Amino acid sequence: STGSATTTPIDSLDDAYITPVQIGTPAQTLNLDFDTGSSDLWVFSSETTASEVDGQTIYTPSKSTTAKLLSGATWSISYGDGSSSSGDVYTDTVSVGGLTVTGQAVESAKKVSSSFTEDSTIDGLLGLAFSTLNTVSPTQQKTFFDNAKASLDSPVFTADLGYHAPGTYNFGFIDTTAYTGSITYTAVSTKQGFWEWTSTGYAVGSGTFKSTSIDGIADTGTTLLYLPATVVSAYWAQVSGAKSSSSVGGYVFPCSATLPSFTFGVGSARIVIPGDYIDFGPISTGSSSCFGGIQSSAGIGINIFGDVALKAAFVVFNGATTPTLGFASK
Numbered sequence: 204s205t206g207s208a209t210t211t212p213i214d215s216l217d218d219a220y221i222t223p224v225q226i227g228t229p230a231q232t233l234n235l236d237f238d239t240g241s242s243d244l245w246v247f248s249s250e251t252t253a254s255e256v257d258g259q260t261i262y263t264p265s266k267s268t269t270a271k272l273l274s275g276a277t278w279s280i281s282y283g284d285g286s287s288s289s290g291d292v293y294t295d296t297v298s299v300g301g302l303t304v305t306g307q308a309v310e311s312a313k314k315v316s317s318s319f320t321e322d323s324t325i326d327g328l329l330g331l332a333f334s335t336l337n338t339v340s341p342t343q344q345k346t347f348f349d350n351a352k353a354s355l356d357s358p359v360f361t362a363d364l365g366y367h368a369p370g371t372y373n374f375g376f377i378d379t380t381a382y383t384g385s386i387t388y389t390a391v392s393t394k395q396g397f398w399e400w401t402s403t404g405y406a407v408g409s410g411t412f413k414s415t416s417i418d419g420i421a422d423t424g425t426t427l428l429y430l431p432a433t434v435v436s437a438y439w440a441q442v443s444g445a446k447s448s449s450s451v452g453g454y455v456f457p458c459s460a461t462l463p464s465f466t467f468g469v470g471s472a473r474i475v476i477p478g479d480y481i482d483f484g485p486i487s488t489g490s491s492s493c494f495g496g497i498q499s500s501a502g503i504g505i506n507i508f509g510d511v512a513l514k515a516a517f518v519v520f521n522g523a524t525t526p527t528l529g530f531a532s533k
Contacts, residue, residue, distance in 0.1 A: 204354045205375035206302025210237065210364065213324040216483055217510060218426050220364060221324060222372055225298040226309060227267030233260050233326035237372055238424030239362065239398055239520065240507075242336035242346050243280050244297070245288055245310035246327035247319075255315050258323030264311065270295045278310045278338045283425065283503065288315040292339055297347060299329075302374050304351050308337075308344035328424070331360065331520070336396035348374070348522060358522045362423055363533070364514035366480055382517035382531035387472035391526040395505075397422070398520060400528050402508075403470060405430075407438050408463030412473070419506030421513060421520070421528055427483070428465075428476070429500035429507040438465055438497050445495070451486050454495035458485060465497060467512060469530040476515040 210220040221234040226246065233246055247259040264270040270293045279289035290313040297307040312327070319325065330337070334345045352358045355375035363381050364370040371381070392399045397420040404414040417430065435454065439445040441463050445456035456462070462478030481496035496511045519529030 204302055204351075205356055205373070206298075206300035206351075207371060207373045208300030209369050210372050211369045212365065212367065213322070215367070217364075217367060217514065219325065220370070220423070220510070221326075222299070222329070224329060226262055227264070227295045228269040229267075230298070231260075231262055231267065233262060234324065235327050235329040236325050236424060237329050237331055237362075238422070239331040240420060240422035240424045241280065241282065241328065242330040242332045242334055242396065243278060243310050243338055244308065244327070244329045244347055245278065245280070245290070245312055247315070248290070248311040250290060251312045252314055255320045257320050260326045262309065262311065262327075264293045264295070264309075267295055269305075270309075273308060273339075273342075276308075276339050276342060276344075278340070280338045283507075284318065286316045286318040288312045288319060290314065292344070299347065299374065300372065302351055302355075304347055307347055307350055308339060310339065310344075331423070332398065333393050333396045335393070351375075352522055360520050360522070362513060362518045362520065364423070364510055366477075366514050370514070377519060382533045384532055386517070386519060386529040386531040387469045388519070388521070388527045388529040389469050391528055393526060397505075398526075398528055403468030405434055405468065406466040406473075407441050408465075408478075410441075412466065412468070414468075417467075417506055419500075419508050421508050421518060423510060423513060425507045425509030426511070427507075427509050428481075428497045428511040429503055429509065430497065431506065432499045432501045435497055435499045438463075439495065447499075451492070451494070453498045455486060455492045456495055458491045458493040460493075467508075472530065474512070474516045474530055474532065476512060480511055480515060
């Protein structure tokens with residue numbers, strides 16, 4: 204089997220991407236944030252504290268003939284941006300882009316933090332990291348991908364995120380029309396539960412390529428590209444007037460600037476992020492200070508190849524017995 208679903212930016216900055224997901228019988232369609240950096244499928248629901256719902260579409264298990272309470276199971280998750288959610292668990296039928304999993308753990312939120320409430324466009328998350336990170340207790344649950352895997356034509360999914368435009372998540376096949384040139388595959392470590400890999404280096408604009416190992420995660424659920432302070436400083440040094448601002452919370456630059464591209468290595472291959480992808484616009488409405496899309500990972504504890512990087516590529520998440528990641532230009 205295969206599935207194919209369109210993923211759509213939630214706003215004009217590509218802050219995140221939503222993908223329609225069918226849950227239950229009859230189908231309830233919720234728009235979920237597919238997150239290769241976490242492993243819980245959780246939704247706003249009829250159980251979510253009323254004051255913490257503001258415009259989201261909710262899952263109502265009582266209206267699904269295939270929903271069953273997973274008795275005694277609870278979940279609680281905290282994300283790198285400090286947001287969080289928690290609740291209980293149902294199993295139900297879940298379909299993405301025509302691919303159906305029966306018995307999927309659907310984690311129903313009783314509580315969500317402010318950032319989720321305030322984002323009316325995101326109805327929940329669908330995690331696509333390794334199931335070892337799933338937070339359900341006392342019985343850990345599998346991701347949608349893990350559950351689908353044995354039925355898939357090939358044990359893969361692909362992320363093809365758009366720049367200010369829709370893209371695609373495919374399950375079970377590689378669309379050879381969706382990229383240019385060849386796909387370069389690179390080793391993954393699952394030791395931390397992430398799609399963790401090692402980039403071979405970077406370049407800033409038209410500058411020479413610096414060969415250097417950068418361990419990080421491929422994370423569709425993080426907006427920006429978070430890299431070591433050395434690398435980030437080298438990038439922003441090429442933008443007149445750019446500076447790191449403690450008050451704003453990262454690198455800012457004059458909105459009048461033209462940003463250089465940033466290249467990262469995948470083995471001997473090179474993925475080029477155009478400068479425009481690195482512009483996240485005024486720090487506040489009407490400001491002439493703009494927020495940068497490449498930021499330091501110092502104090503995160505991990506480097507993160509978030510959407511800024513991933514959207515410059517066609518990315519294969521290969522979930523074979525020995526997992527790997529593939530990157531192609533597009």
